[PDB]
Scaffold this active site. Structure first.
Site, PDB file in Angstrom:
ATOM      1  N   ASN A  37      88.780  14.179  44.464  1.00  0.00           N
ATOM      2  CA  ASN A  37      89.369  13.509  45.637  1.00  0.00           C
ATOM      3  C   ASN A  37      90.686  14.105  46.125  1.00  0.00           C
ATOM      4  O   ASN A  37      91.560  14.428  45.302  1.00  0.00           O
ATOM      5  CB  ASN A  37      89.579  12.028  45.286  1.00  0.00           C
ATOM      6  CG  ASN A  37      89.879  11.173  46.501  1.00  0.00           C
ATOM      7  OD1 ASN A  37      89.275  11.356  47.565  1.00  0.00           O
ATOM      8  ND2 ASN A  37      90.803  10.216  46.344  1.00  0.00           N
ATOM      9  N   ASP A 107      89.776  16.660  38.619  1.00  0.00           N
ATOM     10  CA  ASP A 107      89.924  15.264  39.081  1.00  0.00           C
ATOM     11  C   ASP A 107      88.637  14.441  38.903  1.00  0.00           C
ATOM     12  O   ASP A 107      88.102  14.373  37.798  1.00  0.00           O
ATOM     13  CB  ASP A 107      90.362  15.333  40.563  1.00  0.00           C
ATOM     14  CG  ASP A 107      90.744  13.986  41.147  1.00  0.00           C
ATOM     15  OD1 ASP A 107      91.859  13.487  40.857  1.00  0.00           O
ATOM     16  OD2 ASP A 107      89.916  13.435  41.896  1.00  0.00           O
ATOM     17  N   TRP A 108      88.131  13.800  39.950  1.00  0.00           N
ATOM     18  CA  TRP A 108      86.895  13.046  39.757  1.00  0.00           C
ATOM     19  C   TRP A 108      85.686  13.941  39.453  1.00  0.00           C
ATOM     20  O   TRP A 108      84.667  13.478  38.948  1.00  0.00           O
ATOM     21  CB  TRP A 108      86.620  12.135  40.952  1.00  0.00           C
ATOM     22  CG  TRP A 108      87.472  10.918  40.850  1.00  0.00           C
ATOM     23  CD1 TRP A 108      88.571  10.615  41.595  1.00  0.00           C
ATOM     24  CD2 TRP A 108      87.327   9.866  39.888  1.00  0.00           C
ATOM     25  NE1 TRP A 108      89.133   9.424  41.156  1.00  0.00           N
ATOM     26  CE2 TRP A 108      88.375   8.945  40.112  1.00  0.00           C
ATOM     27  CE3 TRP A 108      86.402   9.615  38.848  1.00  0.00           C
ATOM     28  CZ2 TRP A 108      88.528   7.780  39.341  1.00  0.00           C
ATOM     29  CZ3 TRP A 108      86.553   8.461  38.074  1.00  0.00           C
ATOM     30  CH2 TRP A 108      87.611   7.552  38.330  1.00  0.00           C
ATOM     31  N   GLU A 131      93.553  19.309  35.124  1.00  0.00           N
ATOM     32  CA  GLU A 131      94.009  18.068  35.772  1.00  0.00           C
ATOM     33  C   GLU A 131      92.843  17.094  35.924  1.00  0.00           C
ATOM     34  O   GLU A 131      92.443  16.665  37.029  1.00  0.00           O
ATOM     35  CB  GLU A 131      94.655  18.416  37.110  1.00  0.00           C
ATOM     36  CG  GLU A 131      96.146  18.850  36.951  1.00  0.00           C
ATOM     37  CD  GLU A 131      97.056  17.684  36.593  1.00  0.00           C
ATOM     38  OE1 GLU A 131      97.018  16.692  37.355  1.00  0.00           O
ATOM     39  OE2 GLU A 131      97.811  17.754  35.581  1.00  0.00           O
ATOM     40  N   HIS A 271      99.063  18.752  40.871  1.00  0.00           N
ATOM     41  CA  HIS A 271      97.697  18.249  40.687  1.00  0.00           C
ATOM     42  C   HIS A 271      96.590  19.163  41.244  1.00  0.00           C
ATOM     43  O   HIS A 271      95.646  19.501  40.502  1.00  0.00           O
ATOM     44  CB  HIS A 271      97.516  16.842  41.267  1.00  0.00           C
ATOM     45  CG  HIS A 271      96.164  16.262  40.970  1.00  0.00           C
ATOM     46  ND1 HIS A 271      95.750  15.955  39.688  1.00  0.00           N
ATOM     47  CD2 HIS A 271      95.100  16.021  41.775  1.00  0.00           C
ATOM     48  CE1 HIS A 271      94.494  15.550  39.719  1.00  0.00           C
ATOM     49  NE2 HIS A 271      94.074  15.584  40.974  1.00  0.00           N
TER      50      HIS A 271
HETATM   51 CL   LIG Z   1      91.888   9.170  42.978  1.00  0.00          CL
END
Ligand SMILES: [Cl-]
Ligand SMILES: [Cl-]
Ligand SMILES: [Mg+2]
Ligand SMILES: [Mg+2]
Ligand SMILES: [Mg+2]
Length: 295
Positions: A37, A107-108, A131, A271
């Site tokens: 995301n 991330d996701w 990350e 990030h």
């Molecule tokens: Cl998020």
């Protein structure tokens, strides 16, 4: 190198009634890059060239993101973790990937990727992560700088902040990249979310899914499961650490450092590190893959 051009033209596959988009260049076993995301396949554009000739290079756009169709109806209950997984499991099956897949996640994309691996452990040749959401956390573990904003995304303030103002794309994204982006680059990230309203729902549903202080209990159980598994799995791993980093720091970084059969490198970034150190990231992934596929 850096650069704004996409890695390839999108191909399309029909999934459950929706056309899903993906990049597919070259031949050989798959090297699967999965974004999180509020990104798309575009995130890996300057990292994928590094693996030319090493395999079939694939980068999928999650449902409702990139050039994949939007779901209709849409609302607060749409685009939850489990729904994203339903569409992704099907696309990955449609692609005819075989049993020697190298996962590259963020991330996701890392929560989806770690869970797919726990469930298809024999088809996974190696995992490169950065990350990531590697375990359930406490607010005390979340980065101080954005603690209040993410508590707001999770409250009823989320809809105005995201659906109306598009804050995850316009503020969080650039705010977690150390260098300034060009208009062409920002335009490619903005493209799927140009329209106000439900077209931006995916970027709001995601922060509401993060496993913190025990909530939402369902994603917390899934993360607890892949955390326990990974901490004991023998699959080769590549931990691309970042400084200052954001999510994978403190207690969570201490935990990842206990994982078996893992190599580590640290690159500059907060990030969304693929926009700050793409060549260092790509070079390490290429080296990792050459070790796994001796020619
Ligand atoms: Cl998020
Ligand atoms: Cl809950
Ligand atoms: Mg159609
Ligand atoms: Mg579109
Ligand atoms: Mg901390």
């Amino acid at each position: 190198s850096l650069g704004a051009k996409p890695f390839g033209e999108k191909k399309f596959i029909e999934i459950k009634g929706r056309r899903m988009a993906y990049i597919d260049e070259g031949t050989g076993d798959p090297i699967l890059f999965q974004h999180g995301n509020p990104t798309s396949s575009y995130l890996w554009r300057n990292i994928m060239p590094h693996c030319a000739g090493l395999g079939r290079l694939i980068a999928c756009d999650l449902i409702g993101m990139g050039d994949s169709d939007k779901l209709d109806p849409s609302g607060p209950e749409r685009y939850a973790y489990a729904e994203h997984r339903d569409y992704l499991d099907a696309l990955w099956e449609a692609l005819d990937l075989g049993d020697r897949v190298v996962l590259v996640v963020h991330d996701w994309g890392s929560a989806l990727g770690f869970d797919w691996a726990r469930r298809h452990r024999e088809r996974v040749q190696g995992i490169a992560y950065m990350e990531a959401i590697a375990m359930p956390i406490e607010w005390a573990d979340f980065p101080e700088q954005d603690r209040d904003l993410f508590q707001a995304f999770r409250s009823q303030a989320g809809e105005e902040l995201v659906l109306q103002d598009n804050v995850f794309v316009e503020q969080v994204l650039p705010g977690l990249i150390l260098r300034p982006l060009s208009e062409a680059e920002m335009a490619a990230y903005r493209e799927p979310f140009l329209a106000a309203g439900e077209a931006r729902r995916p970027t709001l549903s995601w922060p509401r899914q993060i496993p913190i202080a025990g909530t939402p209990a369902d994603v917390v159980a899934i993360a607890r499961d892949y955390a326990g598994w990974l901490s004991e799995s023998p699959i080769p791993k590549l931990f691309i650490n970042a400084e200052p980093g954001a999510l994978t720091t403190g207690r969570m970084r201490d935990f990842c450092r206990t994982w078996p059969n893992q190599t580590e490198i640290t690159v500059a970034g907060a990030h969304f590190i693929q926009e700050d150190s793409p060549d260092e990231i790509g070079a390490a992934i290429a080296a990792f893959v050459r070790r796994l596929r001796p020619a």
